[PDB]
């Protein structure tokens, strides 16, 4: 419950990759044909359909999903 320098740098590099990743940005923009609820429903299962897990997939799903919430909210 104290040392944070190294973790903070780690989160900056991961976070900056997600924030500037053109492919991830392109995918978020490609599902602007409505129902962000159903796309999340699908991608969430399909991305772990091979039985693998790592926290790169988690944060990728967090980022993609957090943008679908924005779009979902933009309908009211």
């Amino acid at each position: 419950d104290a040392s944070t320098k190294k973790l903070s740098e780690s989160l900056k590099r991961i976070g900056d990759e997600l924030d500037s990743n053109m492919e991830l940005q392109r995918m978020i923009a490609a599902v602007d044909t409505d129902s962000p609820r159903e796309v999340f429903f699908r991608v969430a299962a399909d991305m772990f359909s091979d039985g693998n897990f790592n926290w790169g997939r988690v944060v990728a799903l967090f980022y993609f999903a957090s943008k679908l919430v924005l779009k979902a909210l933009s309908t009211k």
């Binding site: 790169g56 990728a60 799903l61």
Partner: protein
């Protein structure tokens, strides 16, 4: 086949995991034994990160670690003592 988007996102995640292996490994090194210790430590890293400036990706990464902390407590929570 079905689920092309999910697979593409899974591939991108694997690449992020690969390129930033050390960064994710560092996340597994600050695990906390209780919710209170996790809330304390989560607050310290969040405060440091916001002082360095933030973007959407940085907030997402912060919450990623947060769920790593929460998952550890939620499955393997302790009960104080070490202080």
């Amino acid at each position: 086949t079905m689920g092309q988007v999910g697979r593409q996102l899974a591939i991108i995640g694997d690449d992020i995991n690969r390129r930033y292996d050390s960064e994710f490994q560092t996340m597994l090194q600050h695990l906390q034994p209780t919710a209170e210790n996790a809330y304390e430590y989560f607050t310290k890293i969040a405060t440091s990160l916001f002082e360095s400036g933030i973007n959407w990706g940085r907030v997402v990464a912060l919450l990623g670690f947060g769920y790593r902390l929460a998952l550890h407590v939620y499955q393997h929570g302790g009960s104080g003592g070490s202080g």
